[PDB]
Design a protein around this nucleic acid. Structure first.
Ligand SMILES: [Mg+2]
Ligand SMILES: [Mg+2]
Ligand SMILES: [Mg+2]
Ligand SMILES: [Mg+2]
Ligand SMILES: [Mg+2]
Ligand SMILES: [Mg+2]
Ligand SMILES: [Mg+2]
Ligand SMILES: [Mg+2]
Ligand SMILES: [Mg+2]
Ligand SMILES: [Mg+2]
Ligand SMILES: [Mg+2]
Ligand SMILES: [Mg+2]
Ligand SMILES: [Mg+2]
Ligand SMILES: [Mg+2]
Ligand SMILES: [Mg+2]
Ligand SMILES: [Mg+2]
Ligand SMILES: [Mg+2]
Ligand SMILES: [Mg+2]
Ligand SMILES: [Mg+2]
Ligand SMILES: [Mg+2]
Ligand SMILES: [Mg+2]
Ligand SMILES: [Mg+2]
Ligand SMILES: [Mg+2]
Ligand SMILES: [Mg+2]
Ligand SMILES: [Mg+2]
Ligand SMILES: [Zn+2]
Lengths: 165, 98, 97, 73, 51
RNA sequence: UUAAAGGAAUUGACGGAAGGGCACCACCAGGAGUGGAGCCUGCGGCUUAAUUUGACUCAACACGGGAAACCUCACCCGGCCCGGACACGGACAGGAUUGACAGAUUGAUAGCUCUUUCUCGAUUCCGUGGGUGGUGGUGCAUGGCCGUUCUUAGUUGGUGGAGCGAUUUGUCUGGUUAAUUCCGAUAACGAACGAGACUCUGGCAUGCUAACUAGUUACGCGACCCCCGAGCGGUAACUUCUUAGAGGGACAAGUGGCGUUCAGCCACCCGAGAUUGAGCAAUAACAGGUCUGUGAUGCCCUUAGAUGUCCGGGGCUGCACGCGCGCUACACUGACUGGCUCAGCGUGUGCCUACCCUACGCCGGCAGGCGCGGGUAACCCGUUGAACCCCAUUCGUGAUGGGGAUCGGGGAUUGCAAUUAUUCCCCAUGAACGAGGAAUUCCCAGUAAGUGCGGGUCAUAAGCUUGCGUUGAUUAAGUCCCUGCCCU
RNA sequence: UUCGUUAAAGA
């Protein structure tokens, strides 16, 4: 019945991807959040959440994932159970830098001081097969002026195209 | 200031049927779009949900314009007080999982 | 009867095109060519900064929307037979009879 | 800036609307210990005049729920 | 009550942003509602690349 | 009275110290200009009830995509509402908490208040704590992002020499290059980040792959001049033209000279190309800007007569003045009229909250209106019949017919509302301006400049900006004198 | 040719 252009439907889908991904990294900051994958299918719209700790996604008895299914379906326009969610456990914890920063947030919140936390995440990323990391923590640290503390080990490529992948 | 008697019981009936409430920031000042599920647009919805988020019943999340309300286990334990009025019915969040 | 494959990534476009031609060669259907549409590009120029300090330095964001069309004249039963294909989500399928 | 907005007081401190009536309201009049006599005027039949009585005025009559206003010479 | 006069069907005041309602900064007519302050952060997420 | 004063020596940082390099954001040889005149738009000073504010050398000054009639709006003037969550608690009205017609006051038919008195019913009203909000302050508290240093080429570890050690050599006398890019000399050897390499685009080509949403040769339908088998457009095969996938193709390879065996420069040819333009871009700093981007945030102010949010006006535009980016001209290589002839990016609809792109016919001189049609797009605008340019006439060195600023009258369009800002069209008034002093900006080939179109805000909507096309120069291809930066 | 001052601390 209704239709829009190909030049606008793709950017609407991309805004949907960014909306869902950043809202799930808002509300699912408790467990280890890595990313989402959404398959476009006209029968059942499948949304796959790649998470490091899948226990909070699965809930107690399959409650939180159905609640987030209701969250998606009661605004984004998918009645009668069209959107279905599926979780994926991520085995490599040290691979996802988003999960590393997400765990570093909760370690820096409840005590666990900055030197020890940075050397801990460097040791964990270096243990998990990575060639080289660089953890930079900036802000007000034990004073007034913002001390820029950088920590780097291994090998790192900064310039060119293949930095992004 | 008196909400009609159907209003609060209808929005609580919707929250009991689903467990997830959704609204936007648009309280009447640029434009008046009604709520996609109910009769009152946004302001009475926010006034009804601020009492639930302020008593520690329903969690709150925000997605760039939109308030998404999150049901809690203790949220259901305090919605037992609303469940004084109907019989004991579990909503379609806690009962079963397909 | 035509089928439009509208794609976001050209590598997955060529992969699903090779898969479709590989699955369509063995049947007794006159398979027409995957016609290369011109690439759509939505360029957006951005100030790079919330406050105006420095030179007029502009972000230049782009997309590369690709599009292919095939012609497979067949009855609707054969069309629904060809329709069931598992696909990468970077490609969208439309049919037109 | 350091702009100081001071109360120049063009107008005095005014009072808000306060809803005040008598103690109780006797709408109906009892005659001969059982017959009910009506003094005030009812509201016309526009899904308002079921038990709603209109307001008294020198030449107007005003309804409470749906705000129907009637006039007569 | 008269809370909403000025019916606001046009102009700068009608355009409200999807991200933070920054109606002072402009909102582009691209089938899109951003600020240019947040489109920079979210362009690589919605599918725009610099090249 | 004091817990240090001091000595060599090491690394930063800093010099109004020296040496060597690099840079058209420096110069040379030039081009285009600006600064001269008018206008457009920001900034300062005035004025104002308010002329909201941030930014002040590059690294502020058509920048906040900042083009404001109300919104935007944060500034003045006057007036509504609380969205005052939530806990304890006062009256609790023998259930009376919120909404308003008529008249006065107010722009208002704000029940804002008053006279009048109907209605809704345990969500109330008031107090004490607490929470919310702010384009309020603090970017010299902050995050993120950007700018600048710096698109310059510079940084670091392992083993080994020197030193007791901090440290140093490696990372360098010289040559070359855009480069700490290499060659060389070598107490240094293999290495790493950065530069290259990477990605996109442009240039060439295959009968490699292939197309009724793109064309071509013949052929048919079929019009037209000579009439003589010819010519010009309208309506069965192949990708050469259009589009896009892979692969190829260029590497200073070949020759001669300049150079130490070198690293590498110069002339020619084959070649489409003897190399195009961008993106990303280190170690590390500025106490650079942004709290006026946010539901990013620390601290301070307020929260009922509001620094919250609306409503109605004015304002950012306001003028003796100075400054900056730009536009128009100062004409005959030209202005006017008529004819002819060529594009390339890209945009466009019932939107995840308000909306187009426009063909055809008629009317009107025009700005415009009316009816009807296509397009959610290589399909429809559209074989984007653009401007510049080319041909013919007029003008004839006169502030002239160049310049069109200012100014009056009228007519159309959006918008609820255009007047002390819309915009467009017609008539008329017709200024300075005679190629611009001191100084100063950008630039090395499809490049400067002339010239038009498309996107951004948009409804009305570009003189700004981002991109695309047409025509298309002069003169260098060198240097440390001026300036700035780097290294030792 | 000339161009003044910026404490105590804070790694
Ligand atoms: Mg920092
Ligand atoms: Mg920090
Ligand atoms: Mg900090
Ligand atoms: Mg600080
Ligand atoms: Mg600015
Ligand atoms: Mg708008
Ligand atoms: Mg803005
Ligand atoms: Mg000494
Ligand atoms: Mg100007
Ligand atoms: Mg200024
Ligand atoms: Mg001034
Ligand atoms: Mg403000
Ligand atoms: Mg601070
Ligand atoms: Mg030793
Ligand atoms: Mg050294
Ligand atoms: Mg082509
Ligand atoms: Mg860097
Ligand atoms: Mg919060
Ligand atoms: Mg203020
Ligand atoms: Mg100007
Ligand atoms: Mg709009
Ligand atoms: Mg006049
Ligand atoms: Mg202008
Ligand atoms: Mg200079
Ligand atoms: Mg001192
Ligand atoms: Zn926003």
């Amino acid at each position: 019945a209704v239709q829009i252009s190909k030049k606008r439907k793709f950017v609407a889908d991309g805004i949907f991807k960014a909306e869902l991904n950043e809202f799930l990294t808002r509300e699912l900051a408790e467990d280890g959040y890595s990313g989402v994958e959404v398959r476009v299918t006209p029968t059942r719209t499948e949304i796959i959440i790649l998470a490091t700790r899948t226990q909070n996604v699965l809930g107690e008895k399959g409650r939180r994932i159905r609640e987030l299914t209701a969250v998606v379906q009661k605004r984004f326009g998918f009645p009668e159970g069209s959107v279905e969610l599926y979780a994926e456990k991520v085995a490599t914890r040290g691979l996802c830098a988003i999960a590393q920063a997400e765990s570093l947030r909760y370690k820096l919140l409840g005590g666990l001081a900055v030197r020890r936390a940075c050397y801990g995440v460097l040791r964990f990323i270096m243990e998990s097969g990575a060639k080289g990391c660089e953890v930079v923590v900036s802000g007000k640290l034990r004073g007034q002026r913002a001390k820029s503390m950088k920590f780097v080990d291994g090998l790192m490529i900064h310039s060119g195209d293949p930095v992004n992948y | 200031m008196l909400m009609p008697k159907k209003n609060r019981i209808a929005i609580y009936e919707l929250l009991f049927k689903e467990g997830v409430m959704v609204a936007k920031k648009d309280v009447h000042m640029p434009k008046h779009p009604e709520l996609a599920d109910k009769n009152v647009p946004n302001l009475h919805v926010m006034k009804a949900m601020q009492s639930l988020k302020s008593r520690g019943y329903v969690k709150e999340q925000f997605a760039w314009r939109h308030f998404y309300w999150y049901l809690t286990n203790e949220g259901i334990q305090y919605l037992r007080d609303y469940l004084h009025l109907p019989p004991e019915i579990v909503p379609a969040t806690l009962r079963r999982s397909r | 009867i035509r089928i439009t494959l509208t794609s976001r990534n050209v590598k997955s476009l060529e992969k699903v095109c090779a898969d479709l031609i590989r699955g369509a060669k063995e049947k007794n259907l006159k398979v027409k060519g995957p016609v290369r549409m011109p690439t759509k590009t939505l360029r957006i120029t951005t100030r790079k900064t919330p406050c105006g300090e420095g030179s007029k330095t502009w972000d230049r964001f782009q997309m590369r929307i690709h599009k292919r069309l095939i012609d497979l004249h067949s009855p609707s039963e054969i069309v629904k037979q060809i329709t069931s294909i598992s696909i990468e989500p970077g490609v969208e399928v439309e049919v037109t009879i | 800036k350091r702009k100081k907005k001071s109360y120049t007081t063009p107008k005095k401190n005014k009072h808000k609307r306060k809803k005040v009536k008598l103690a109780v309201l006797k709408y109906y009049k009892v005659d001969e210990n059982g017959k009910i006599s009506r003094l005030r005027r009812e509201c016309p039949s526009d899904e308002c005049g079921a038990g709603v009585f209109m307001a008294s005025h020198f030449d107007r009559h005003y309804c409470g729920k749906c705000c129907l206003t009637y006039c007569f010479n | 009550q008269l809370y909403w006069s000025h019916p606001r069907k046009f102009g700068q005041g009608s355009r409200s942003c999807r991200v933070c309602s920054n109606r002072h900064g402009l909102i582009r007519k691209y089938g899109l509602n951003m600020c240019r302050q947040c489109f920079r952060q979210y362009a690589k997420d919605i599918g725009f690349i610099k090249l």
